[PDB]
Amino acid sequence: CPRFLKVKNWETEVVLTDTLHLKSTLETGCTEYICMGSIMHPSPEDVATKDQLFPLAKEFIDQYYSSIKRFGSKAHMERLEEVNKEIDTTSTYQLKDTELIYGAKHAWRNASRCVGRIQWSKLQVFDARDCTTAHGMFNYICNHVKYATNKGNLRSAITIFPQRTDGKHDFRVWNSQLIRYAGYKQPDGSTLGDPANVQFTEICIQQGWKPPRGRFDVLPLLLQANGNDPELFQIPPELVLEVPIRHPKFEWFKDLGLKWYGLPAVSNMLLEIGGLEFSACPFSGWYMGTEIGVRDYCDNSRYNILEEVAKKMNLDMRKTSSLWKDQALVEINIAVLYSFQSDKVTIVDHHSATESFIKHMENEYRCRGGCPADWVWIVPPMSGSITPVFHQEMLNYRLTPSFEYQPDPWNTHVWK
Amino acid sequence: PRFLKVKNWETEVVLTDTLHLKSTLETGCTEYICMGSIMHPSEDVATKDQLFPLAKEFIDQYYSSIKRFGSKAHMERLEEVNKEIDTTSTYQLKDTELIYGAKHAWRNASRCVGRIQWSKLQVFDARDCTTAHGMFNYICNHVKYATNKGNLRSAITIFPQRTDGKHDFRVWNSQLIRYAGYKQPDGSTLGDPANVQFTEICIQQGWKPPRGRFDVLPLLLQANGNDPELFQIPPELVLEVPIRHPKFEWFKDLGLKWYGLPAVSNMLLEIGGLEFSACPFSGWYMGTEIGVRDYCDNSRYNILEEVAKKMNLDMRKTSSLWKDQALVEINIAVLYSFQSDKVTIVDHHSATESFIKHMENEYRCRGGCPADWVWIVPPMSGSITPVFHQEMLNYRLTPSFEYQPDPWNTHVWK
Ligand code: HEM
Numbered sequence: 132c133p134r135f136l137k138v139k140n141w142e143t144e145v146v147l148t149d150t151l152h153l154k155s156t157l158e159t160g161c162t163e164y165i166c167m168g169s170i171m172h173p174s175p176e177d178v179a180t181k182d183q184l185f186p187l188a189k190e191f192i193d194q195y196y197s198s199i200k201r202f203g204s205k206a207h208m209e210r211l212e213e214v215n216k217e218i219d220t221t222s223t224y225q226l227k228d229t230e231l232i233y234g235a236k237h238a239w240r241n242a243s244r245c246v247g248r249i250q251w252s253k254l255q256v257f258d259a260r261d262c263t264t265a266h267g268m269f270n271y272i273c274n275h276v277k278y279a280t281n282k283g284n285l286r287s288a289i290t291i292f293p294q295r296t297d298g299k300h301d302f303r304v305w306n307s308q309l310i311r312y313a314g315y316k317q318p319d320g321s322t323l324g325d326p327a328n329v330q331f332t333e334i335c336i337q338q339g340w341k342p343p344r345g346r347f348d349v350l351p352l353l354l355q356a357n358g359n360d361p362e363l364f365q366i367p368p369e370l371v372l373e374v375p376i377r378h379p380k381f382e383w384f385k386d387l388g389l390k391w392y393g394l395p396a397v398s399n400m401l402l403e404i405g406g407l408e409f410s411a412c413p414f415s416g417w418y419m420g421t422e423i424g425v426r427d428y429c430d431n432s433r434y435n436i437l438e439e440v441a442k443k444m445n446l447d448m449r450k451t452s453s454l455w456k457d458q459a460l461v462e463i464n465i466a467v468l469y470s471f472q473s474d475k476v477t478i479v480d481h482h483s484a485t486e487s488f489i490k491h492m493e494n495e496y497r498c499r500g501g502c503p504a505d506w507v508w509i510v511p512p513m514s515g516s517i518t519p520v521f522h523q524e525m526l527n528y529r530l531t532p533s534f535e536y537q538p539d540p541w542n543t544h545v546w547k
Numbered sequence: 548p549r550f551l552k553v554k555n556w557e558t559e560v561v562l563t564d565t566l567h568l569k570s571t572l573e574t575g576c577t578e579y580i581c582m583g584s585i586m587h588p589s590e591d592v593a594t595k596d597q598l599f600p601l602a603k604e605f606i607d608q609y610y611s612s613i614k615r616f617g618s619k620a621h622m623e624r625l626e627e628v629n630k631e632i633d634t635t636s637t638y639q640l641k642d643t644e645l646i647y648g649a650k651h652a653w654r655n656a657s658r659c660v661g662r663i664q665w666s667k668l669q670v671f672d673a674r675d676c677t678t679a680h681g682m683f684n685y686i687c688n689h690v691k692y693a694t695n696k697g698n699l700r701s702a703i704t705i706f707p708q709r710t711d712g713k714h715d716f717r718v719w720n721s722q723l724i725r726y727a728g729y730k731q732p733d734g735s736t737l738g739d740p741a742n743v744q745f746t747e748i749c750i751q752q753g754w755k756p757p758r759g760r761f762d763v764l765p766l767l768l769q770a771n772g773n774d775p776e777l778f779q780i781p782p783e784l785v786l787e788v789p790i791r792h793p794k795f796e797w798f799k800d801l802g803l804k805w806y807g808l809p810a811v812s813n814m815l816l817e818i819g820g821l822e823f824s825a826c827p828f829s830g831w832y833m834g835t836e837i838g839v840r841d842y843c844d845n846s847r848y849n850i851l852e853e854v855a856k857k858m859n860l861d862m863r864k865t866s867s868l869w870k871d872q873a874l875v876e877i878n879i880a881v882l883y884s885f886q887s888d889k890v891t892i893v894d895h896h897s898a899t900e901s902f903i904k905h906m907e908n909e910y911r912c913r914g915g916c917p918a919d920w921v922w923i924v925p926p927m928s929g930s931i932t933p934v935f936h937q938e939m940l941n942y943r944l945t946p947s948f949e950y951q952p953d954p955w956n957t958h959v960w961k
C-alpha cells in the first residue's frame with residue numbers, strides 16, 4: 132500500500148492515477164529519507180539459483196499469459212509445468228519465441244528513461260539464440276543494421292544473443308553502441324574524434340585495429356561469444372548511413388566539416404526476462420535531435436563546438452549574460468534537424484517527441500494503470516520548460532522485463 | 548546507512564555525503580517508487596509531546612553551531628525551553644536562534660540554486676506584530692530595505708508563530724509583488740494568468756482593478772486569524788524594469804515590464820518545532836524565472852508566438868526550433884534590461900556555476916548539501932550549465948521552508 136498514486140500535470144491540471152507501481156520489483160536506491168533520482172547508476176560470474184529462478188519465471192509466465200487473455204488456461208499451467216521442470220533438471224530454462232518477443236517489447240515499454248516509448252509495440256525482434264561464434268554475432272549484427280537503417284527510413288529492432296548460463300560463457304558486445312566514432316588522445320593532451328570513446332578506441336587498437344586517425348572514424352565491432360576473448364570486425368562501410376550537418380541559413384556551417392551517423396544503437400545493456408539474463412542485446416531506434424545537437428556536439432567532454440560556432444556567428448563571447456552559448460546551441464540543433472530531414476533520414480525534434488510521450492503516458496495510465504518515467508532523463512537537455520514533460524509529474528519505479536546496466540566487459544573478462 | 552558519493556560527470560569530481568545521516572523528515576520516495584518530480588509530495592499544530600524533542604534538537608544544533616555544545620548556557624537554555632513548553636504549550640526563540648534558524652532554513656532549501664548567499668540574510672523580527680496594519684508596516688520596511696534602489700539585498704520578515712491554528716498570520720499573496728490576472732469576457736486573460744483567482748479574491752474584497760496588463764496587486768494581510776485586510780503598496784517602493792532588446796529595436800514595442808523584487812510570501816518557516824506561517828522572504832532574480840517561465844509558459848504571459856512573429860521565423864513546423872530561438876532572445880532582453888537599469892539580476896550560467904562552487908564548500912565544511920536536481924537545473928539550456936551533469940542527493944533537513952495550504956481554503960470568516 133497505498134493502492135493509488137496521483138500525478139498532476141501543472142500546465143494542464145490533468146491528473147492521472149497510478150496502480151501499476153504495485154507491480155514494481157527491483158529497488159530504486161531511494162529511501163524514505165533520501166532521494167537518488169539524479170544518480171546515474173544507483174543499485175561476478177555469479178548467477179541465479181534454482182530457488183531464485185522459480186518465482187522469477189513464474190511471475191513472467193503469469194504476466195505473459197495474462198497479456199494474451201489466457202491466464203489460468205490449460206496452456207498456462209502446462210507452460211508453468213514445463214518451465215519448473217527445466218529449472219529443476221538444468222537450473223535454467225528456454226523462452227519460447229513468443230515469450231522472447233513479448234519480454235523484449237516489454238523491456239522497452241518498461242524503460243523509465245526512454246522518451247520514445249510510444250513506439251514500443253512496433254519493434255522487430257531478431258532471435259539470435261542459435262549464435263555460437265563472434266563471426267556469427269557479426270553476421271547477426273550486420274543484418275540488424277541493414278534492416279534497421281532501411282535506406283534512411285529507420286525501423287526499431289533488437290537482436291538477442293544467447294542468455295547467460297554459468298557466468299563464464301557470456302556473449303557480449305564490447306562496443307557501447309554498434310556505431311560510434313573513435314577518440315584519439317594526442318601526446319599534447321588534446322583529443323581528436325569523440326572524447327567519450329578514447330578508452331574503447333585504445334582497446335580496439337590493442338586488439339589489432341589499424342586506426343585511420345581521423346575526426347569521424349567508425350569503430351570496429353568487438354564481439355565476444357560464449358565467453359571467449361573478443362574479436363574485431365569492420366562494419367561494411369556501406370551499412371553505416373551518415374548525414375553531413377549543414378545549416379539552412381548559414382552558408383559557412385558546412386565548412387565546419389561535421390557529420391553524424393543515422394542509427395543510434397545501444398549494445399552494452401543487459402536484457403532481463405523472467406530471470407534470464409541476455410547480456411548481449413543490441414537495440415536501435417532513431418535519433419531525437421538534441422542527442423546529437425546538444426550532447427554529442429556541445430557537451431564540453433564531447434565534440435565541444437559551441438565556441439567555434441559562436442565565433443562564426445560573431446556573438447559577444449566576453450560575458451555569459453550575452454547568452455552566446457544558448458544562441459549557438461539552438462542554431463546547431465536547427466542544423467542537425469535540417470540535415471537529417473533533407474537526407475530523408477528519420478529523426479525527431481524534442482518538441483514532437485515529448486508531446487508524443489505525454490500522449491503515450493496518458494494512454495498507458497488509461498490502459499495499463501501507469502507508466503514509469505524518469506523525469507531527469509525524459510526532459511530534453513535544452514528548452515526544457517517549453518516541452519510538455521517539464522510540467523508533468525512522474526513516478527519512477529522498476530518493472531520487469533527490463534534493460535539494466537552491466538559492468539564494462541574489459542573490467543570483468545578473464546583472458547584465455 | 549553509509550557515506551554516499553556523488554559524481555559530476557563533466558569534471559569527474561566526486562564528493563562524499565555524510566550529512567544525510569542527520570536528516571529526519573521524509574522525502575516521499577520509497578525503495579520501490581521515486582517521487583522526485585512530485586511538486587508537493589506527501590489543526591496542524593503539534594502538541595506539547597511532539598514539541599520538546601523537536602525543540603531539543605534545534606537547540607542542540609544551535610549550540611553545536613556556536614562551538615558551545617553541552618555548555619552551561621546550553622544546559623540551562625534547555626531547561627528554559629522544557630519549562631516553557633510545559634506551562635504554555637509552546638516556547639519562544641531567542642533573537643540569535645531566530646536568525647540562525649532563518650539562515651539555516653535557506654541553507655537547507657534543496658530547491659534553491661541561490662544558496663551560495665545563505666548567510667548574508669537580513670532577518671526582520673516581527674514577532675511583536677498583532678494586526679494587519681502592523682503587518683503592512685513591517686512588509687513595506689522589508690520591500691524598501693531589500694530593494695535598495697536596485698542593489699537588491701536578501702531579507703526575511705518573520706511574523707508571530709502559529710499557536711492553536713485559529714490565530715494565524717498569513718500573507719494571502721503568493722508573492723509580495725505580483726501582477727494581477729483578469730478573466731476576460733471573450734474567455735482570454737489580461738495580465739498574469741497565474742493570479743486570476745487571487746485577483747478575483749481581492750476584487751471581492753473592494754479592490755478597484757485598473758484592468759491593465761501589469762497592475763501591482765494589493766497586499767491581503769491576515770493577522771491573528773482575523774479576516775484579511777487589503778493594503779496598497781506605496782508605488783514609490785515597487786521597482787520595475789521596462790524590457791527592451793539590445794539588437795531588436797522593435798522589442799520595446801511589445802510593452803513588457805517586470806518587477807525587480809522576487810519575494811516569496813506563501814511558505815511556512817519551521818524552526819525547532821515552531822511554525823511561522825507568515826515569513827515573506829526575498830532575494831534577486833535569475834533571469835530565466837522571468838524570461839522562460841513567467842513570459843513563456845503556456846499558463847502564463849505566453850509571448851513566444853508574438854516574439855518569433857516579429858522575428859519573422861518559420862512557425863509552421865516545430866522542428867524549425869522557432870520557440871527555442873525566440874526563447875533565447877526573450878532571455879537576452881530580460882538580462883540586458885535589468886543590467887542597463889542597474890537592478891540586481893543573475894544569469895543562469897553564473898548562478899549554476901556559483902551553486903557548484905557552493906556545493907563544494909558545503910561538502911567540505913558541512914559534509915553535504917541537499918539539492919533537488921529537478922529544480923536546480925534551469926528551465927532552458929540545461930546541459931550547457933554545470934549542474935545538469937552534477938549528481939545531487941536530496942534529503943530533508945530542519946530548519947526548513949515548507950509548503951502550506953492556500954489561505955482561502957482554510958479560513959473560516961466571521
Ligand atoms: C524509436 C525511437 C526511440 C527514441 C526516439 C528514443 C529516445 C530515447 C532517448 C532520447 C533516450 C535518452 C538517451 C540518452 O540521453 O542517453 C532513451 C533512452 C533509452 N531508450 Fe529509447 N529511444 C528510441 C528507441 C528505443 C528502443 C527501440 C529501445 C529498446 C528496445 C529503447 C530503450 C531505451 C533505454 C533502455 C533507454 C535508457 C538508456 C540508458 O539508461 O542509458 N529506446 N531513448
Ligand code: HEM
Nearest residue numbers: 653656658659660661664701702828829830831832833948
Ligand atoms: C539571493 C538570490 C536568490 C536566487 C538567485 C534564488 C534562486 C532561486 C530559484 C531560481 C528558485 C527556483 C524558483 C522557482 O522556480 O520557483 C529558488 C527557489 C527557492 N528559494 Fe532561492 N533564490 C534566492 C534567494 C533566496 C532566499 C533569500 C531564500 C530564503 C530565505 C530562498 C529560498 C528558496 C526556497 C525555499 C525555494 C523553493 C521554493 C519552492 O519550492 O516553491 N531563496 N530560488
Ligand SMILES: Cc1cc(N)nc(CCc2cc(CC[C@H]3CCN3C)cc(F)c2F)c1
Nearest residue numbers: 308395396397414415416417418419422426
Ligand atoms: C535506442 C535508442 C534510441 C535513441 N534515440 N537514443 C538512444 C540512447 C543512445 C544515445 C544517446 C545519446 C544522447 C547523448 C548520450 C551520450 C552520452 N549521453 C548520455 C547519443 C547517442 F549517440 C546515442 F546513441 C537509444
Ligand SMILES: Cc1cc(N)nc(CCc2cc(CC[C@H]3CCN3C)cc(F)c2F)c1
Nearest residue numbers: 809810811828829830831832833836840841
Ligand atoms: C527568494 C527567491 C528568489 C528568487 N530569485 N526566486 C524565488 C522564487 C520565486 C519566484 C519564482 C518564479 C519562477 C516562475 C514560476 C513558475 C514556478 N514559479 C513560481 C517566478 C517568480 F516571479 C518568483 F517570485 C525566490
Ligand SMILES: C[C@H](O)[C@H](O)[C@H]1CNc2nc(N)[nH]c(=O)c2N1
Nearest residue numbers: 521522523524584585586921922
Ligand atoms: C512536475 C515538476 O515537478 C514541476 O513541473 C517542476 C519541475 N521543476 C521545476 N523547477 C523549477 N525551478 N521551478 C518549477 O516550478 C519547477 N516545476
Ligand SMILES: C[C@H](O)[C@H](O)[C@H]1CNc2nc(N)[nH]c(=O)c2N1
Nearest residue numbers: 169170171507508935936937938
Ligand atoms: C547528474 C545527472 O543524473 C546526469 O547528468 C543525467 C541528467 N539527465 C540526463 N538525461 C538524459 N537523457 N541523458 C543523460 O545522460 C542525462 N544525464
Ligand SMILES: [Zn+2]
Nearest residue numbers: 161166576581
Ligand atoms: Zn527518489
